[PDB]
């Protein structure tokens, strides 16, 4: 048809200049303002409606941000920052977004004037280095062997979540899970909360009945009623290969001419099943767990040896059982060895919860994996409880790997801001203004805590700044429940240094990344 001469495509949109920078900064500010009120011990929860019909009720920043679909690429960058913070340290997700928004605001203040973004970026990087130095300076060590202090750290981590009502139970569950899943092999230490330390939520009951199991629990039942549903000291054998006759890999058509060959073939199928079962029985086990199917004839031959069999178990669940009971998964039954038999599980029991059967292996001696059994009001309540427990376990692992500890309640923010402000007095350049501005941008955390508590922001923040101008007041923060100044070595709110370092680094680098853009091109085909 009509042909208009064009360089780029019709659907290609390009904008540049101060408009792009202002749009990016306001997008980041809006993203921060979305979750501004979900920070602190007095945070309010939010209902998120899934596009799939689900409901998410949470005050965690990452879930709220991941449930929101946005068009502006700056908001997408902010959501990616939230996800990065969640994946790296598992805490501080709400704080990093607010910090990035405040830093971008104070940067926009300078970009309105005739200051180039590169100068602001260099000042921001200098400030970030100084913040890291100050945070490492004001940190204090912790004794990992002290269970009380670890429980206190986990509590101060979870005081801002809905699970804070059952603080002691949640802290004990998280500490026990992290401690027992901790592993050491070949000179390489690991925690691996992701693979092991599985959280299983069964709606109903009371949350005070939730506990961490000394072993693994799965939603499975015996393959046949004659199986024993209660074994005192079981010997467990784990497999992946099916216990049933299966076709080979190659095309293996038979040609039957004699009369008895058909019955002979069926008899050898049965004999092969019997041989596999006898090879299993030779180790004299009590429980056989398979990731794949178990034939009925195999069940009968296992019963002849009084062996309980469970089939169709997930690979992750089977690995967890192997870690818990100290067994090794074996593919070919004829290659079973004595050390592959799992001895160490002190009880196996299949009990009925509600209208379902659940398999419990919950008396292991020194188990390296666990199931956190969560019981509660409903599915959404248990999902929020699981998220809070995940936060607690992440904080526990962070403390275990890095025993440095940092005062909370905004005390660290004010201390770092004061140190950077004092340091900025001896530079006498053009970068001192952005340096000081991004230093004072850290005060958005105590300000947010005061705002959420409902107290007077200006008076309390001025008093806190005046206190931090003194000679030893690095641990003075705000009480987020009463809206009063308090020493954090008395209140007891402390946070891992790793979380604070990650939060500051991520916020500063988000500001730096969003400050480097002045041109936006959109609408072009993906071309691939």
């Amino acid at each position: 048809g009509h042909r208009p001469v064009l360089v780029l495509s019709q659907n290609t949109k390009r904008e540049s200049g101060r408009k792009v920078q202002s749009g990016n900064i306001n997008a980041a500010k809006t993203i921060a303002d979305i979750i501004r009120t979900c920070l602190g011990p007095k945070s309010m929860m939010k209902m998120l409606l899934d596009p799939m019909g689900g409901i998410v009720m949470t005050n965690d920043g990452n879930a709220i941000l991941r449930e929101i679909q946005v068009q502006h690429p700056a908001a997408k960058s902010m959501i990616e920052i939230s996800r990065t913070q969640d994946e790296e340290v598992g805490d501080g997700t709400t704080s990093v977004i607010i910090l990035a928004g405040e830093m971008l605001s104070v940067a926009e203040h300078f970009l309105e004037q005739q200051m180039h973004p590169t100068v602001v970026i260099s000042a921001y990087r200098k400030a970030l280095d100084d913040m890291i130095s100050t945070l490492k300076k004001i940190s204090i060590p912790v004794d990992i062997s002290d269970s009380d202090m670890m429980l206190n750290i986990i509590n101060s981590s979870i005081t801002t979540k809905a699970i804070s009502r059952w603080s002691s139970l949640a802290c004990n569950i998280a500490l026990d899970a992290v401690k027992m899943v901790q592993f050491e092999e070949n000179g390489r230490k690991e925690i691996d909360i992701k693979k092991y330390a599985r959280v299983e939520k069964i709606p109903g009951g009371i949350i005070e009945d939730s506990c961490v199991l000394r072993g693994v629990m799965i939603n499975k039942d015996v393959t046949h009623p004659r199986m024993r549903r209660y074994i005192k000291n079981p010997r467990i054998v784990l497999l992946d290969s099916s216990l049933e006759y299966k076709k080979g890999e190659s095309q293996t058509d038979i040609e039957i001419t004699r009369e008895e060959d058909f019955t002979r073939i069926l008899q050898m199928e049965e004999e092969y099943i019997q041989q596999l079962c006898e090879d299993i029985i030779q180790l004299k086990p009590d429980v056989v767990i398979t990731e794949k199917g178990i034939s009925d004839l195999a069940q009968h031959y296992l019963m002849r040896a009084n062996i309980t069999a469970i089939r169709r178990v997930r690979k992750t669940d089977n690995n967890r059982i192997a870690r818990a009971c100290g067994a090794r998964i074996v593919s070919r039954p004829e290659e079973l060895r004595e050390d592959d038999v799992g001895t160490g599980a002190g009880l196996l029991e299949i009990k009925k919860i509600g209208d379902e059967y659940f398999t419990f292996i919950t008396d292991c001696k020194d188990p390296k994996a666990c199931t956190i059994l969560l019981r509660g009001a409903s599915k959404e309540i248990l999902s929020e409880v699981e998220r809070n427990l995940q936060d607690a376990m992440q904080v526990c692992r962070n403390v275990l790997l890095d025993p440095q500890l940092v005062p909370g309640g905004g005390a660290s923010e004010m201390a770092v801001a004061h140190a950077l402000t004092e340091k900025s007095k001896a530079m006498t350049g053009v970068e001192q203004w952005p340096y000081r501005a991004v230093a004072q941008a850290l005060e958005v955390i105590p300000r947010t805590l005061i705002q959420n508590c409902g107290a007077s922001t200006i008076r309390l923040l001025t008093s806190l700044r005046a206190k931090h101008t003194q000679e030893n007041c690095e641990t003075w923060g705000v009480n987020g429940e009463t809206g009063t100044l308090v020493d954090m070595k008395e209140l007891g709110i402390w946070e891992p240094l790793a979380v604070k370092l990650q939060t500051y680094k991520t916020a500063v680098e988000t500001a730096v990344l969003l400050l480097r853009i002045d041109d936006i091109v959109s609408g072009h085909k993906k071309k691939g």
Partner: protein, 532 residues
């Protein structure tokens, strides 16, 4: 009269159209030049976001319709392929050359005369660069490579952290040095595996003294760390044996079926038994490994990795001294594995990186390898980090291969402009005008640099030209050839002393490619657009 199903544009109309297209392509990326340039953030139709400063990436992601604009985009791609740096500069120079050539043509100067003048100017500029503006890196030492990396990484997301990233780049490039035949050292960049993982700050990016694998162990029962690794590299899968299409199993006596089915896996069992019996600790294969073989490796207490990339496996094998085996077949018709096929490394570890795990092969023997793990705030920032890191690696490779460098900051462009303006008066009468326009168009680089910093471009370019004219005229002022632009303070500066260096190949190739593209576009004076 023609009766051609299409549109026809002839003469000044098509010439102006081509110049407009080239100028639009140039103006797209002119804002991303020099240390005071700023990145661009591109959004696809599916919402994918790319934040980049590289001209080649921008022009590749853009969807372009005009043929001259396509020529400029392919010019940027070619400059990226053959040099790795100066992708924005070549596009800007080519567009400015085309614009000035069209301005000359509009004055009834024949395009052939303009093309001849452009060719003469390019040849003389290359000769003058090679004879006057090059600096030998032998007297500069290792600091020359650091300075070149710093200059390359300016305007990038890793510019401020250049003090760290330049050392990382130089160490990575020096770790892969080798000498081929004729005794010429070679630096095979793209052999440095780059892994991107969001998480900690930029300054905590790691340079691995070995190789980094984006893979994990096949089974959870395998150890995650082996001290004295004996790496075996295989190019075949370890699964249950299956006969080919030309072989069929037909059973007449039933008693043979069980033996057939047993051998069907005993074959692979025997192969793995040989491989483990030679003493290997780490087994890497490009093919898959099923559960039975994984359990064999688990019982052996060895690390097995499946679906390893072919290039990664080749790099690991040659760094560790192993040999890729596509089959365990020797020249005697048997099935054997020898210890001489085993590579060695000081450690093989599966480490955790931001809630994910990757395998590090540390300190391979008989050859040094290098890998870089980039840490950033999110995926887009890591991608820009990788692009900038590749640019720096290419720049360092060019500097190390050819030991000549030229001052940056537009010093070369100003010197060439002055010299070619002087030289045009000695050649022809209209090619004189063409060479003068070539010299004038070479000044678009310092002009754009000054404009990006909101500095007085006219005054700074005038001062630079005065300095270079004094250098060329006065015989004892030859030290002024290094006077470039200091964009931080907006003043001329001796860039050779300041450490703003570029490989000579970047400037030479950019000049040649831009001249050829400008000549190609200037060769058109009629366009027939056939209807589809």
């Amino acid at each position: 009269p023609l009766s051609v199903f299409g549109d026809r544009s002839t003469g000044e109309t098509i010439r102006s159209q081509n110049v407009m297209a080239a100028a639009s392509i140039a103006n797209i990326v002119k804002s991303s030049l020099g240390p005071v340039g700023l990145d661009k953030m591109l959004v696809d139709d599916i919402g994918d976001v790319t934040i980049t400063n590289d001209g080649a990436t921008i022009l590749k992601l853009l969807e372009v319709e005009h043929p001259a604009a396509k020529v400029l985009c392919e010019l940027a791609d070619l400059q990226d392929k053959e040099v790795g740096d100066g992708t924005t500069s070549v596009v800007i120079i080519a567009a400015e050359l085309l614009k000035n050539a069209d301005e000359l043509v509009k004055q009834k100067i024949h395009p052939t005369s303009v093309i001849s003048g452009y060719r003469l100017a390019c040849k003389e500029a290359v000769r003058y660069i090679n004879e006057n503006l090059i600096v030998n890196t032998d007297e500069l030492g290792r600091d020359c490579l650091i300075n070149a990396a710093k200059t390359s990484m300016s305007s990038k997301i890793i510019g401020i952290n250049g003090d760290f990233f330049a050392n990382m780049v130089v160490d990575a490039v020096l770790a892969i040095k080798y000498t081929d035949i004729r005794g010429q050292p070679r630096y095979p960049v793209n052999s440095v595996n780059i892994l991107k993982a969001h998480g900690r700050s930029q300054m905590e990016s790691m340079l691995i003294s070995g190789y980094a694998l984006n893979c994990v162990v096949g089974s959870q029962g395998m150890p995650k760390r082996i001290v004295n690794a004996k790496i075996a590299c295989l190019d075949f899968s370890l699964q249950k044996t299956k006969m080919k299409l030309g072989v069929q199993v037909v059973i007449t006596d039933p008693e043979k079926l069980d033996q057939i089915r047993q051998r069907e896996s005993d074959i692979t069992k025997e192969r793995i038994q040989k491989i483990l019996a030679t003493g290997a600790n780490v087994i890497l294969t490009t093919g898959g490994i099923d559960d039975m073989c994984l359990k064999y490796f688990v019982e052996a207490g060895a690390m097995a990795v499946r679906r390893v990339l072919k290039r990664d496996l080749k790099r690991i094998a040659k760094a560790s001294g192993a040999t890729i085996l596509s089959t365990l077949a020797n020249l005697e018709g048997e099935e054997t594995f020898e210890a001489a096929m085993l590579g060695q490394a000081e450690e093989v570890v599966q480490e955790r990186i931001c809630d994910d795990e990757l395998i590090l092969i540390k300190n391979t023997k008989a050859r040094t390898s290098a890998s870089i793990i980039l840490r950033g705030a999110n995926d887009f920032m890591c991608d820009e980090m990788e692009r900038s890191l590749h640019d720096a690696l290419c720049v360092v490779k060019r500097v190390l291969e050819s030991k000549s460098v030229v001052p940056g900051g537009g010093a070369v462009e100003a010197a060439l402009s002055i010299y070619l303006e002087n030289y045009a008066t000695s050649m022809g009468s209209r090619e004189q005008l063409a060479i003068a326009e070539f010299a004038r168009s070479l000044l678009v680089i310092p002009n754009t640099l000054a404009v990006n910093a909101a500095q007085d471009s006219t005054d700074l370019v005038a001062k630079l030209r005065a300095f270079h004219n004094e250098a060329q005229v006065n015989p004892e002022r030859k030290n002024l050839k290094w006077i470039g632009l200091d964009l931080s303070n907006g003043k001329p500066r001796d860039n050779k002393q300041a450490g703003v260096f570029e490989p000579t190949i970047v400037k030479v190739k950019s000049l040649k490619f831009a001249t050829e593209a400008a000549i190609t576009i200037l060769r058109i004076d009629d366009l027939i657009k056939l209807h589809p």
